[PDB]
Curated annotation (Swiss-Prot):
Chain positions with N6-acetyllysine modification: 49, 75
Signal sequence segment: none
Mutagenesis / variant outcome for changing residue 88 to D: Abolishes ATPase activity
Subcellular location(s) per record: Nucleus; Cytoplasm; Melanosome; Cell membrane
Residues of the full protein shown: 10 to 225 of 732
Protein name as it appears in the record: Heat shock protein HSP 90-alpha
Family: Belongs to the heat shock protein 90 family.
Free-text function comment from the UniProt entry: Molecular chaperone that promotes the maturation, structural maintenance and proper regulation of specific target proteins involved for instance in cell cycle control and signal transduction. Undergoes a functional cycle that is linked to its ATPase activity which is essential for its chaperone activity. This cycle probably induces conformational changes in the client proteins, thereby causing their activation. Interacts dynamically with various co-chaperones that modulate its substrate recognition, ATPase cycle and chaperone function. (Microbial infection) Seems to interfere with N.meningitidis NadA-mediated invasion of human cells. Decreasing HSP90 levels increases adhesion and entry of E.coli expressing NadA into human Chang cells; increasing its levels leads to decreased adhesion and invasion.
Length: 217
């Protein structure tokens, strides 16, 4: 009877990750634009990984040979999406790496901030993904790994995230990070702003970065 039905799982964040998310999403920082550098860096790392695998097994790229990063502002939805064609994540990867297991870098980073370090150093602690919450009230991650199905991870912080199968628009391979922006952070939907941030912070990224300005007609 229903058009579609699917199981949704809700997981609690590991305590230290929940603490980090609360700090990031609530605290004032003057340099919030670093979120985009961090997400592009993550995409680059994911692209390095599938590239590495393809060196010995070319069929790893049967799901797509092009290795690149797309930035997609949608003013109508107030979303900024970062898409890459990297190695992607399995369901276990999402649950393990995006919330339930805290690397030592989670607590370490919060200690560093207490000791006077800057938020911009977050990537050195391996938790730069969570800088998304500097500008986003909700983050949705759509991901597809070879031989696995496509999943959607989502959290508005507040202590938990959800995982479910995603069947909306099939990706060949990779990860989309959809930032649902806070009301006062819509500057990051402007072409001028995105370009200047990429030029300043991501000049050494070794993959094509392409802007797609999205407008529903
Ligand atoms: O899918 C990703 C991925 C991504 O491509 C973008 C991000 O912002 C966060 C991520 O975890 N990875 C897979 C292996 C290493 C990273």
């Amino acid at each position: 009877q229903p058009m579609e039905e699917e199981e949704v799982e809700t997981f609690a964040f590991q305590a230290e990750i929940a603490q980090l998310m609360s700090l990031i999403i609530n605290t004032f920082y003057s340099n919030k634009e670093i979120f985009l550098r961090e997400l592009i860096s993550n995409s680059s790392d994911a692209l390095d990984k599938i590239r590495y695998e393809s060196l010995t097994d070319p069929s790893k790229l049967d799901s797509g040979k092009e290795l690149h990063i797309n930035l997609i502002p949608n003013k109508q939805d107030r979303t900024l999406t970062i898409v890459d064609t990297g190695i992607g994540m399995t369901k276990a990867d999402l649950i393990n790496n995006l919330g339930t297991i805290a690397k030592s870098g989670t607590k370490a980073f919060m200690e560093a901030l207490q000791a006077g370090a800057d938020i911009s150093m977050i990537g050195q602690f391996g938790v730069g993904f969570y800088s998304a919450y500097l500008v986003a009230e909700k983050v949705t991650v759509i991901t597809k790994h070879n031989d696995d199905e496509q999943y959607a991870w989502e959290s508005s912080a507040g202590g938990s995230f959800t995982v479910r199968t995603d069947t909306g628009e099939p990706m060949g391979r990779g990860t989309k990070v959809i930032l649902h922006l806070k009301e006062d952070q819509t500057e990051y939907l402007e072409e001028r702003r995105i370009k200047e941030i990429v030029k300043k912070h991501s000049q050494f990224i070794g993959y094509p970065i392409t802007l797609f300005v999205e407008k529903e007609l």
